[PDB]
Amino acid sequence: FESLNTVLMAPIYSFLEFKLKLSSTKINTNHYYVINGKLYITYNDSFKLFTTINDYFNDLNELSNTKLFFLYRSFNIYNIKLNSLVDFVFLKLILFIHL
Amino acid sequence: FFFSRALKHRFYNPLNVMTEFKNGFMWFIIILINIFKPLLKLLENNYINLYNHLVIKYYQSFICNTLINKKKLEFNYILSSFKFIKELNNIIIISLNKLF
Amino acid sequence: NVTGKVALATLGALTGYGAFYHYNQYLNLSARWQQIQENIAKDQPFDVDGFDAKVYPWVRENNVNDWEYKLVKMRGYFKDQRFFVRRKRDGKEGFLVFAPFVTAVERVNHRLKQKDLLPVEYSVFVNLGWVPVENKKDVELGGEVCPPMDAPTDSTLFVNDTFTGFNPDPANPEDTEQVTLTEITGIVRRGEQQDILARRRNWNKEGIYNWVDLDYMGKIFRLFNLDAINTAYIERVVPSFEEGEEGLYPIPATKDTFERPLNTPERHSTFFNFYAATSALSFISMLLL
Amino acid sequence: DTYKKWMYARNWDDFLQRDCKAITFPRAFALWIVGTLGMATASKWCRQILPV
Amino acid sequence: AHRSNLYQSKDIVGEKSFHEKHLEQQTAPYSGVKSLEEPVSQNKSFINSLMRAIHNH
Amino acid sequence: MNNTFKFLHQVISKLTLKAQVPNYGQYSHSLKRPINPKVVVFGNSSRAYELISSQFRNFNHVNGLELKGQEDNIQANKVAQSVLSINDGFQDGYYITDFPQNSKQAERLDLITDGVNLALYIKDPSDKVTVTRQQEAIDYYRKTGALVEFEVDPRGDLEEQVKQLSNQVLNGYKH
Amino acid sequence: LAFIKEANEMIQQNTGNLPWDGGKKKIFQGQANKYLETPYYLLAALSGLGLLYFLYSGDAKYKTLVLTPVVGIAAFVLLRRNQILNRVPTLTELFLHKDGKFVDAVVSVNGQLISKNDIPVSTLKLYRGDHTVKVNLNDFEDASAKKFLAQQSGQEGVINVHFSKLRNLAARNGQVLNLGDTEVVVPFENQANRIILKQIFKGVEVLP
Amino acid sequence: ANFVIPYLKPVADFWNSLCIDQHQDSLFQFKGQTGSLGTDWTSKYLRSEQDVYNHKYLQYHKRVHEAPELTDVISDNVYRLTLFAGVERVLSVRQAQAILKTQFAGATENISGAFQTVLNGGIFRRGYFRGALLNLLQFCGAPYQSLIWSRNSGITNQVIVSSIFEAFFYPLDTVKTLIYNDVQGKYKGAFHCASQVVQNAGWSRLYAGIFQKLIFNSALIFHLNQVWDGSSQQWASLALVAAAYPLLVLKTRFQVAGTPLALATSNEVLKVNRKTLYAGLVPYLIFNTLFAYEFAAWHSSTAQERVIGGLQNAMKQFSSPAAEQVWSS
Amino acid sequence: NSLLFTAVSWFSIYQFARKGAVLPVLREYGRYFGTHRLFRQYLHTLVLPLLYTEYA
Amino acid sequence: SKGFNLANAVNTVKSTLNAPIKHIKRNIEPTGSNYS
């Protein structure tokens, strides 16, 4: 029943979001805080140091890169069964040659 | 197509021809013996591997019987075609030694 | 444990569905077969002469389903070539014997004296019958299937028919149009299809045939109406006592001896029993685990 | 022809009988001398290349 | 050590692969038409609001 | 490994390495960065602080100077708990200052955190305190191989120094 | 946020900060290796049946009669090797008590997770080097097996086999750890609290 | 001709069969006559060119008026199951992408990201063709069995039979979806995945989005019938499917939920951002418009008449354009 | 041809304006109604090709 | 996320048409050899 409700209301929700974007402007100026003597911009539940627009874009790109490759960078280090097999086979052949 | 090369080793001499035939046959036989000789060592290694498998299976069965508080080694797993492998290897080596 | 339970559940569900499907097919085929036997027992054959003998009603309407297992009494003459298909009848190894049956001819040559053209022959395959394996050589090339029709009493019938182009004149003044017509009564049977699992697979190059491939039969016998031949064939039926004891082959078929279809109620019952037993055993084993 | 054979010699003897036309005993013996020289040369080559 | 370095030289940055380059290009935020967000009264029209809604999301 | 089986060995090893790190050839650059970059920074000067701020703008600072005088194991445990989490902003990189100053503390921290991803010694002649307080830690990290030494002229192009430090830090990370 | 929580838990587990639940701290987590047995058994049986059929009906090529025994013997060797490897007793988890003088072990014996309770820490010892397996031939009730083991080994009664000879199959992916009475294999690909694990593996009780 | 040709000629013959009109070639394999005119090369070619449309009509008639044959159905949708079978996995991943941790594995949150997620595993068993065999088995399940028990029925009976058989075969769909959405190779086959799901979640877990699948299947059947008819309201049916599309997305997300594959639990499936309810709308519509299901049995009278009329025009091709209208003929 | 040109122009204008780039052909805000340059560019690319098609 | 973008596509096309420039220039480069 809830899924039927969500499906029926899905186009209406998209239209309402479009109407909200049409009726609203993306300027709130509630984000820039001058804590002591350095700029700060609203960032999740906290602040983020702000000095330059290019620096902010680079920070966003770095955060995106981190959250995009986080799972790749956590590969199983000890998943070396195949490499161990290859090294063992080659060293076994070399041992046979030495003998 | 055969005169010149045979002329290099003086194969117009029947004594040289006979000696070369004997040497070539001995070369072929020794090559075949070298190729097919490591089979005996492979059979001995099979015996050694069977012994190692028996020891490892005994060790694993002992550890398993130490885990669960029982004392009855699974000799069905410990042997696990030991008789068949031993008999096959024994008859193979006996036949090979009987042939030569 | 859990993997075994899942496998048993899947096997039981699939086999139960198969058993249900085969039971329903068994019921439908039993009803269809009793209807077919009731219709055949009436023995009221649709006559095949005239325009229906040139283009067959089942071919014309593409409704062989509505024409299958319906007795037709066709008139025409047979060809010499015979075709053998491996088949068992009453548990005995044998060959179904088919032969082209020219039901109509068309003469399109207007230069009659200058050129002697081959008439365009409209033919259908007639299942002449069944002969045991040991007597396959006993089948004769060009042998008479049955005595020809008697000479018509009406003198206006001794001309070429408008549709079939046949003249039933024993002494035709034109020696190039003499034809010995013959009347055969038989049921209409649809062509078979390849099913390897049923062991009906034919190696055309090697000359081994297990299912009725009407397309290949027409192509090899160089017949004209290839599509009409592929539509269906006629299984000749004789009024009981096909051949009780004689050296007469192929043995014709009767209302109680004609060739059964591959999809039989007995076969579907065997499939249903096997699937039901498998499903019950799988469910019992799943319960035990 | 389906290119299953190129020389059409069923066996070496046929070769020596037909392609070499060693119909007579002098021809057979001359070919045997040639084969002896070839075998000696081949054995010498095998001993030189693999001196075991 | 070579497998840990993925069979490429340590202390060499290297060039990003196409995928990485693509992921460096697709993850960048889209900078919409800035002028449509200005407090200019001409942006309060329905047409300008529609343009801002469809071009800036 | 003899000189003739080396080619086959390297080809088969390159093929089989994709079983552990799939498509590693297409992500070799990105995999230069670890999941949770823990960096221990040595250096106390104006240029050192500027380079730390430039390079670690997206990193979180841990002030080991706050943990001074306490037990070595307690300080290492506190630093480890500080550097073994991910913020709600998906910030996983931490850099630690004025820590550990002792080889024993560095070893304890590495054991608890499964090692530090990087140790960065910014050698600036204008800095005098570091060599008098963190020399044992610097030597320990040099021995363990996690130490990267960036020699900074106290004067020069800040952008050039930033680029060089970025390249060295990217190359010096440890998984 | 869900992935952030998942990644925090993964980082804690990798570093060894496993959950603390009522005086039972998970201080070890290991994974056992599984090797195929059924496909190799089926391949060996199929090769044997093929050889039997080709002997019954002489219509097999020389190359087929050469390859089939080779494939069958290779499959049989792999089957035996994997049967030995799978049934290796591998330690999977170890829980330290709040007292610190006892541990609880979970051992994988090819699928049957066995639990050993209240193992004293002083009875634990990790074998850095290879040890000697003591096989009591008197345990065997087979005269042929006794003779084979007394011929392959120079000993007569309780033979001693150095674990270097058995390390290819008995323990190739871990260290042999004595649990007082058992000798389990601690895997190399294991997640554990390093300090506590090092302390206990030396036989030293960790203070509460 | 003794070692290479015996193993090369079959390949060339298969190529020729795929490239030459076999039936026509068969007509040319029998040269001569047996007493009937019209069996020469010219007549056989003349009948052969019309035989293409004749055989298309005969195949359609067999599919409509006879019991369906699985192979025939597979021949109607060969590209959906053989060449583009991985597009099913791409669409499933895209639908479930909102709750899967694929955006953290170098994949964007769009169709390109779904493609890279599928293609990073290769082009085989663990990659593009992962679960292709399961998809083929599923096609031989609910759709094929629905085509048998409701051969020439109307849309209502088609929907009823298909819903019954999809509810009967839904666990296979759940297993296939789970095999589609795991990128770490955590499930080593359909049976392994099903066993893990049953032992860790229960038998009821295999029916996560059954009702959503049933309703979307009803909508899809209506759209397919309209497309087969070609009533020009097929675009209205496409709009109906697009409106009912989030049911398929919800089914996919419910199937991969409360599992290590996904980051969200079953309840959290309904708390996802509504903007993600149309995850694979355009790719799914394009794929099901180009490679639409071809269930010739389920064709209505309008669709049959349209197909036969097209074939009849194709037959109308065969005539002489400059044929003289003659008084006597 | 006119519809394809209009589609290409609309697609290009939308995709470039999504990244800030707007072709400065017309004034930023028109007279009278004050419509935006983007809207007037869309209108011109929709209308003028039709006018040229009709002219030819 | 957002998918296709024509500005990015044009940048990729320019990069593709610019990549083989260096190799063509190197081929047309005059070397230090003077084959008198």
Side-chain angles (χ1 to χ4, degrees):
Chain A
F1 285 156
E2 293 167 347
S3 304
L4 281 179
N5 176 31
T6 57
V7 168
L8 292 181
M9 297 293 101
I12 304 180
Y13 286 149
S14 301
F15 181 76
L16 289 180
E17 192 72 21
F18 180 80
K19 181 184 303 179
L20 174 63
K21 180 57 207 303
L22 190 146
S23 61
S24 182
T25 308
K26 198 191 178 302
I27 286 193
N28 298 333
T29 193
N30 303 127
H31 307 146
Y32 288 86
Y33 299 83
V34 189
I35 314 307
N36 301 20
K38 319 169 70 180
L39 211 45
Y40 287 92
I41 188 179
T42 299
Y43 172 79
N44 293 264
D45 311 328
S46 178
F47 291 145
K48 199 179 193 311
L49 173 60
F50 201 102
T51 61
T52 318
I53 165 186
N54 297 90
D55 297 336
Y56 184 72
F57 282 164
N58 285 264
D59 295 358
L60 291 191
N61 177 73
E62 175 181 352
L63 178 67
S64 181
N65 188 302
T66 289
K67 66 178 58 179
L68 182 65
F69 297 110
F70 189 93
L71 216 58
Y72 275 165
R73 295 157 180 171
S74 61
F75 59 91
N76 200 19
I77 288 182
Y78 313 94
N79 192 347
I80 56 175
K81 191 178 189 301
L82 221 56
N83 303 282
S84 300
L85 171 64
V86 175
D87 293 13
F88 157 72
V89 166
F90 275 89
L91 286 188
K92 192 74 172 184
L93 180 55
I94 296 168
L95 174 66
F96 285 158
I97 295 184
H98 272 57
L99 293 173
Chain B
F1 293 101
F2 303 92
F3 177 77
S4 302
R5 309 283 76 86
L7 185 59
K8 179 184 178 181
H9 316 283
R10 297 173 185 264
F11 286 150
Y12 54 89
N13 188 21
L15 310 180
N16 288 337
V17 165
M18 297 177 183
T19 54
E20 181 53 43
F21 279 175
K22 181 172 172 297
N23 295 139
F25 186 74
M26 291 187 302
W27 170 89
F28 181 72
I29 293 305
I30 193 181
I31 292 299
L32 291 196
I33 290 182
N34 292 15
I35 291 179
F36 292 116
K37 192 167 186 175
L39 294 183
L40 314 178
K41 188 176 299 180
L42 288 181
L43 296 167
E44 182 62 29
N45 292 15
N46 288 12
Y47 264 168
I48 295 182
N49 292 12
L50 183 60
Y51 166 74
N52 295 328
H53 288 52
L54 294 186
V55 176
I56 295 175
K57 287 175 165 72
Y58 176 91
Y59 190 56
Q60 292 182 4
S61 180
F62 197 91
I63 300 174
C64 176
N65 295 132
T66 321
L67 290 173
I68 50 182
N69 199 327
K70 296 181 181 179
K71 202 55 184 297
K72 183 194 302 178
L73 290 87
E74 290 184 344
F75 289 107
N76 176 268
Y77 166 66
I78 292 181
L79 301 186
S80 184
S81 303
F82 152 74
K83 170 188 178 182
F84 167 76
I85 293 187
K86 176 184 177 182
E87 289 297 331
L88 184 59
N89 197 91
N90 184 27
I91 63 179
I92 285 296
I93 63 180
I94 284 179
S95 301
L96 291 185
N97 294 132
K98 178 174 57 181
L99 291 180
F100 48 80
Chain C
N1 182 27
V2 186
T3 309
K5 291 186 178 183
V6 170
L8 289 180
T10 297
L11 182 60
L14 294 182
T15 41
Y17 168 66
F20 173 71
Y21 163 84
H22 280 278
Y23 186 76
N24 291 33
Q25 281 291 128
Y26 157 81
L27 297 180
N28 290 333
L29 289 187
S30 299
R32 175 63 176 181
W33 193 249
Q34 77 168 352
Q35 289 180 358
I36 288 162
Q37 289 186 343
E38 168 60 33
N39 174 82
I40 293 182
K42 300 172 60 62
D43 195 2
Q44 298 175 349
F46 183 85
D47 186 292
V48 180
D49 173 60
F51 187 75
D52 295 327
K54 185 167 55 181
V55 42
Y56 307 134
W58 55 90
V59 180
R60 184 178 62 255
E61 310 180 48
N62 203 344
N63 63 345
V64 65
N65 315 272
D66 304 3
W67 271 96
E68 201 181 353
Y69 298 101
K70 290 185 63 180
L71 292 83
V72 287
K73 178 184 62 180
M74 323 179 65
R75 55 207 76 263
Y77 69 95
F78 286 99
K79 295 186 62 185
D80 299 1
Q81 307 90 26
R82 299 292 183 266
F83 204 98
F84 296 87
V85 173
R86 184 62 167 270
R87 191 61 57 88
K88 292 196 304 297
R89 179 164 293 181
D90 292 327
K92 299 185 302 300
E93 320 293 333
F95 301 95
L96 298 177
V97 183
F98 300 79
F101 186 61
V102 184
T103 56
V105 293
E106 290 190 351
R107 301 168 186 84
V108 301
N109 178 29
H110 70 102
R111 308 171 69 255
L112 299 163
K113 280 188 172 299
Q114 301 91 340
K115 220 284 178 182
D116 192 1
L117 263 182
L118 298 179
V120 178
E121 300 179 340
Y122 291 97
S123 314
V124 72
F125 259 97
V126 162
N127 184 16
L128 286 195
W130 177 90
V131 58
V133 286
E134 322 90 20
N135 302 90
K136 179 179 175 297
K137 66 180 184 303
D138 297 3
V139 181
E140 300 291 341
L141 177 81
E144 300 180 7
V145 187
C146 51
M149 303 190 309
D150 303 323
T153 60
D154 191 6
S155 60
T156 58
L157 294 178
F158 294 101
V159 289
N160 286 265
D161 190 8
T162 317
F163 304 100
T164 74
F166 284 149
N167 193 336
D169 189 6
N172 195 315
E174 321 171 26
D175 299 71
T176 57
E177 294 191 3
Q178 173 68 48
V179 288
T180 304
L181 299 187
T182 311
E183 208 175 26
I184 56 105
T185 302
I187 58 178
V188 173
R189 302 298 309 275
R190 61 170 61 258
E192 303 184 13
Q193 298 184 182
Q194 177 191 185
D195 191 54
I196 302 180
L197 272 305
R199 284 190 160 182
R200 38 187 55 189
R201 172 183 169 182
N202 55 334
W203 293 262
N204 301 327
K205 302 300 297 180
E206 309 186 25
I208 272 66
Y209 310 107
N210 297 279
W211 59 279
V212 182
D213 190 5
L214 296 172
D215 179 63
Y216 174 79
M217 291 179 184
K219 287 172 178 175
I220 189 188
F221 280 168
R222 323 301 159 95
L223 304 175
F224 175 76
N225 49 332
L226 295 179
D227 199 4
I229 290 159
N230 304 349
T231 306
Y233 71 96
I234 274 73
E235 179 177 12
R236 174 169 174 261
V237 180
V238 293
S240 297
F241 185 64
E242 40 191 44
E243 199 55 89
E245 58 287 323
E246 207 70 33
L248 189 273
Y249 298 104
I251 306 178
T254 64
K255 65 175 182 57
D256 308 327
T257 333
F258 64 95
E259 184 65 28
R260 265 55 181 173
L262 178 60
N263 283 23
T264 38
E266 297 78 11
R267 180 173 182 264
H268 281 81
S269 178
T270 298
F271 274 104
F272 152 77
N273 293 331
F274 170 76
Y275 284 159
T278 310
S279 61
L281 289 180
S282 300
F283 286 148
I284 289 177
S285 300
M286 178 181 182
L287 178 66
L288 295 185
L289 294 183
Chain D
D1 196 359
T2 49
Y3 255 19
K4 294 189 299 298
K5 258 187 181 305
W6 273 352
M7 299 296 299
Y8 282 95
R10 304 169 294 181
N11 48 16
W12 183 258
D13 299 1
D14 281 6
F15 185 75
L16 294 180
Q17 241 289 348
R18 308 193 73 97
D19 288 329
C20 295
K21 287 188 172 180
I23 51 181
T24 70
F25 170 70
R27 300 181 181 185
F29 191 79
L31 289 191
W32 181 81
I33 290 184
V34 152
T36 301
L37 297 184
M39 180 60 185
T41 305
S43 48
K44 193 64 176 67
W45 286 355
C46 295
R47 290 174 51 200
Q48 283 186 344
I49 195 171
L50 194 62
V52 179
Chain E
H2 292 3
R3 293 190 182 98
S4 64
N5 291 327
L6 300 182
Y7 288 102
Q8 283 189 348
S9 171
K10 197 170 178 293
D11 303 328
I12 291 187
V13 184
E15 186 193 22
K16 309 174 66 61
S17 66
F18 309 96
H19 286 338
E20 292 176 329
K21 289 198 187 70
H22 202 247
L23 297 179
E24 196 74 2
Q25 187 184 60
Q26 301 302 115
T27 58
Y30 288 77
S31 175
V33 183
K34 51 178 179 180
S35 61
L36 292 174
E37 292 83 62
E38 294 184 351
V40 183
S41 61
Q42 296 171 300
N43 297 123
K44 305 299 298 181
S45 177
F46 177 79
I47 289 180
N48 296 14
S49 299
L50 181 70
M51 293 297 106
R52 174 179 61 258
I54 66 180
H55 291 100
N56 298 73
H57 299 184
Chain F
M1 174 60 62
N2 55 330
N3 301 339
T4 56
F5 295 156
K6 185 179 179 304
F7 168 76
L8 281 177
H9 170 76
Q10 77 171 11
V11 168
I12 300 182
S13 296
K14 287 182 180 180
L15 292 180
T16 56
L17 187 55
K18 271 172 287 188
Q20 175 186 355
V21 189
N23 287 272
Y24 68 90
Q26 309 314 307
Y27 301 103
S28 302
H29 186 277
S30 303
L31 292 170
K32 284 181 171 298
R33 187 180 183 274
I35 46 178
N36 188 258
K38 296 169 288 295
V39 184
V40 173
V41 188
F42 305 95
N44 305 89
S45 68
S46 61
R47 292 306 298 263
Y49 289 156
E50 295 178 20
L51 291 188
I52 293 163
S53 301
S54 301
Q55 177 66 15
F56 299 108
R57 183 181 293 263
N58 295 266
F59 279 56
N60 298 131
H61 169 234
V62 181
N63 189 261
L65 188 59
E66 281 286 332
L67 307 177
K68 188 54 182 297
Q70 303 181 9
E71 220 284 342
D72 295 352
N73 294 15
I74 305 302
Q75 293 183 197
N77 181 29
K78 292 181 177 179
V79 172
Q81 292 178 322
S82 303
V83 304
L84 279 180
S85 60
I86 307 178
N87 301 335
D88 300 332
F90 220 109
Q91 292 185 351
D92 43 19
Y94 304 91
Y95 64 94
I96 319 167
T97 315
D98 297 323
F99 201 72
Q101 307 174 349
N102 280 118
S103 178
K104 179 165 53 184
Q105 297 195 6
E107 181 178 6
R108 190 71 175 186
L109 172 63
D110 282 52
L111 288 175
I112 303 180
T113 55
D114 209 332
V116 292
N117 293 268
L118 177 60
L120 179 65
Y121 187 13
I122 298 180
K123 286 198 58 58
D124 189 58
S126 179
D127 163 64
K128 322 293 183 55
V129 288
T130 301
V131 293
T132 60
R133 54 187 65 259
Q134 304 180 278
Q135 184 55 49
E136 296 187 7
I138 294 173
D139 294 332
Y140 171 85
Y141 284 138
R142 181 180 296 102
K143 181 208 65 175
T144 58
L147 180 65
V148 172
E149 174 234 16
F150 192 57
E151 241 293 335
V152 172
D153 194 304
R155 183 178 49 203
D157 197 81
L158 185 57
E159 254 294 333
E160 289 176 1
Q161 290 192 350
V162 162
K163 297 178 61 176
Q164 295 177 8
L165 178 62
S166 63
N167 295 329
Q168 291 196 13
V169 166
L170 182 59
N171 296 330
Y173 276 139
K174 300 282 186 177
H175 283 247
Chain G
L1 291 181
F3 181 77
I4 282 178
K5 299 181 178 60
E6 186 86 1
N8 284 271
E9 190 61 35
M10 287 182 178
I11 290 177
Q12 298 301 327
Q13 292 186 2
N14 293 336
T15 56
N17 304 330
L18 301 164
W20 172 287
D21 41 316
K24 295 295 186 60
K25 180 182 182 58
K26 192 191 300 293
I27 48 91
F28 178 80
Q29 174 178 342
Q31 299 290 342
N33 296 23
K34 306 303 297 178
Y35 306 87
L36 297 175
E37 302 180 3
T38 305
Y40 291 155
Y41 179 87
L42 265 61
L43 183 59
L46 177 64
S47 177
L49 291 183
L51 275 179
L52 187 66
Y53 174 76
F54 296 155
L55 264 55
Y56 169 78
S57 62
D59 55 1
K61 306 176 183 297
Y62 286 106
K63 55 176 60 62
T64 303
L65 284 183
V66 165
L67 291 179
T68 307
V70 172
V71 178
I73 293 181
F76 187 73
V77 169
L78 293 182
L79 171 63
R80 298 201 73 202
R81 190 179 186 92
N82 295 21
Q83 284 180 355
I84 285 190
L85 286 174
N86 286 279
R87 293 169 171 258
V88 164
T90 290
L91 182 68
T92 52
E93 285 184 345
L94 189 61
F95 299 92
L96 177 66
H97 293 188
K98 51 186 176 182
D99 313 332
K101 294 184 178 178
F102 298 92
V103 294
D104 291 62
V106 180
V107 184
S108 56
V109 67
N110 186 29
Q112 303 93 32
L113 297 176
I114 306 181
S115 182
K116 202 174 183 61
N117 307 121
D118 298 71
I119 311 176
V121 180
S122 60
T123 60
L124 305 188
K125 172 181 176 57
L126 187 68
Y127 293 148
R128 312 177 82 262
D130 291 328
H131 60 102
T132 60
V133 175
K134 298 181 70 276
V135 175
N136 195 337
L137 304 194
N138 186 265
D139 299 1
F140 291 84
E141 48 186 349
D142 188 9
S144 64
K146 274 184 172 175
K147 293 190 61 179
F148 183 82
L149 297 172
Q151 285 284 357
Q152 296 293 136
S153 61
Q155 315 293 137
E156 50 183 2
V158 273
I159 78 179
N160 301 269
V161 191
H162 204 267
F163 202 74
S164 179
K165 296 303 185 62
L166 319 172
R167 230 193 194 282
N168 203 345
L169 303 184
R172 201 174 180 180
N173 309 125
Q175 307 278 76
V176 183
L177 167 77
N178 195 326
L179 293 181
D181 299 331
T182 73
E183 288 166 339
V184 297
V185 178
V186 167
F188 284 134
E189 183 179 359
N190 58 321
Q191 311 165 5
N193 188 276
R194 291 307 162 187
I195 292 92
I196 292 184
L197 199 66
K198 290 190 305 178
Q199 294 302 327
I200 63 177
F201 277 174
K202 300 299 179 302
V204 179
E205 280 74 11
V206 180
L207 76 165
Chain H
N2 298 320
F3 297 103
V4 192
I5 291 187
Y7 303 90
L8 187 66
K9 191 180 184 60
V11 179
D13 293 354
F14 185 67
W15 171 276
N16 291 330
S17 63
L18 294 182
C19 297
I20 307 182
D21 187 13
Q22 288 300 101
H23 172 66
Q24 185 182 36
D25 181 64
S26 298
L27 294 179
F28 299 151
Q29 288 181 352
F30 304 97
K31 311 175 301 178
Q33 85 222 10
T34 51
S36 177
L37 197 63
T39 58
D40 52 325
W41 184 89
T42 300
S43 305
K44 287 185 170 188
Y45 166 75
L46 285 176
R47 70 169 294 104
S48 71
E49 49 178 357
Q50 308 176 9
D51 275 330
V52 184
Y53 307 120
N54 181 31
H55 294 344
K56 294 173 63 178
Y57 165 75
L58 293 188
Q59 293 302 136
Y60 189 66
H61 191 281
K62 172 183 179 60
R63 284 174 169 82
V64 174
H65 293 64
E66 307 177 19
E69 292 180 343
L70 179 56
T71 295
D72 289 355
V73 188
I74 299 184
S75 65
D76 298 0
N77 309 312
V78 59
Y79 291 102
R80 291 185 60 94
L81 309 171
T82 303
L83 182 55
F84 299 98
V87 186
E88 295 278 356
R89 187 188 181 193
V90 176
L91 294 180
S92 176
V93 170
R94 182 64 187 99
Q95 292 164 4
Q97 195 161 354
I99 62 177
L100 292 176
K101 35 181 172 298
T102 60
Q103 60 276 23
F104 317 101
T108 55
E109 281 283 347
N110 62 338
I111 188 63
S112 174
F115 264 106
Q116 281 306 316
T117 294
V118 175
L119 290 181
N120 277 13
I123 201 73
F124 277 138
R125 164 170 159 263
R126 216 184 74 89
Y128 177 78
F129 284 119
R130 179 174 177 87
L133 191 146
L134 270 57
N135 177 33
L136 182 57
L137 291 186
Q138 185 193 17
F139 182 87
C140 302
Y144 176 59
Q145 299 310 319
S146 306
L147 259 65
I148 293 179
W149 298 81
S150 60
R151 196 171 67 188
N152 303 123
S153 64
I155 299 183
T156 301
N157 192 16
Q158 290 172 7
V159 164
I160 294 176
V161 173
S162 181
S163 302
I164 291 299
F165 279 111
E166 284 190 349
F168 181 67
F169 282 143
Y170 193 79
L172 206 160
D173 183 68
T174 302
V175 173
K176 188 197 65 179
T177 297
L178 292 159
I179 293 298
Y180 278 172
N181 294 274
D182 60 324
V183 313
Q184 318 291 154
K186 197 166 304 180
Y187 295 150
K188 309 179 187 305
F191 278 149
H192 180 206
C193 165
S195 315
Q196 292 290 345
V197 169
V198 170
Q199 72 187 16
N200 294 325
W203 286 94
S204 57
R205 179 54 175 79
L206 298 178
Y207 303 88
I210 174 176
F211 283 174
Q212 294 81 0
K213 178 175 179 57
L214 263 50
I215 305 178
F216 180 79
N217 169 79
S218 309
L220 177 62
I221 287 177
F222 178 81
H223 174 66
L224 285 178
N225 283 265
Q226 261 58 226
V227 168
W228 297 332
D229 295 6
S231 304
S232 298
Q233 53 179 325
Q234 54 179 341
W235 312 122
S237 299
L238 186 71
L240 172 67
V241 157
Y245 181 67
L247 282 168
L248 196 65
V249 181
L250 287 179
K251 174 221 65 173
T252 303
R253 293 178 185 175
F254 275 134
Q255 283 171 321
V256 282
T259 55
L261 277 60
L263 297 171
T265 60
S266 302
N267 326 90
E268 299 178 3
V269 175
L270 280 184
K271 297 195 291 289
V272 193
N273 196 329
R274 293 93 69 94
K275 305 193 305 179
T276 71
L277 291 182
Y278 295 91
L281 181 58
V282 186
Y284 189 84
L285 291 188
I286 293 183
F287 185 66
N288 293 32
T289 298
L290 297 179
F291 305 92
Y293 284 107
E294 188 68 20
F295 296 150
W298 277 359
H299 277 200
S300 61
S301 300
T302 303
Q304 299 174 26
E305 191 174 12
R306 175 185 59 90
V307 176
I308 294 178
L311 297 172
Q312 283 178 165
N313 296 329
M315 276 297 187
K316 290 179 180 180
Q317 288 183 348
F318 307 96
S319 62
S320 180
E324 294 179 346
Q325 180 184 0
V326 289
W327 172 72
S328 178
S329 55
Chain I
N1 295 342
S2 301
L3 290 182
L4 286 180
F5 183 87
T6 301
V8 168
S9 303
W10 284 23
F11 186 74
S12 305
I13 290 175
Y14 175 83
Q15 295 293 348
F16 276 90
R18 277 290 293 165
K19 287 191 171 301
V22 177
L23 189 57
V25 173
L26 316 167
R27 43 161 47 198
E28 186 183 23
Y29 295 99
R31 280 173 267 264
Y32 318 133
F33 314 111
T35 60
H36 194 263
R37 197 204 318 264
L38 281 182
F39 172 82
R40 269 172 290 107
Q41 285 183 7
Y42 285 126
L43 185 61
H44 289 359
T45 54
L46 175 61
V47 170
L48 296 181
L50 298 180
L51 265 59
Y52 181 79
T53 276
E54 296 299 330
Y55 169 81
Chain J
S1 178
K2 277 73 175 58
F4 187 85
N5 184 261
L6 192 53
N8 294 334
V10 169
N11 283 328
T12 305
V13 168
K14 283 185 294 185
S15 299
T16 301
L17 265 63
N18 176 80
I21 295 298
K22 65 193 75 172
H23 314 294
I24 296 178
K25 293 225 297 179
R26 189 261 170 183
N27 262 28
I28 319 175
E29 273 184 6
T31 53
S33 176
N34 185 260
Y35 188 14
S36 301

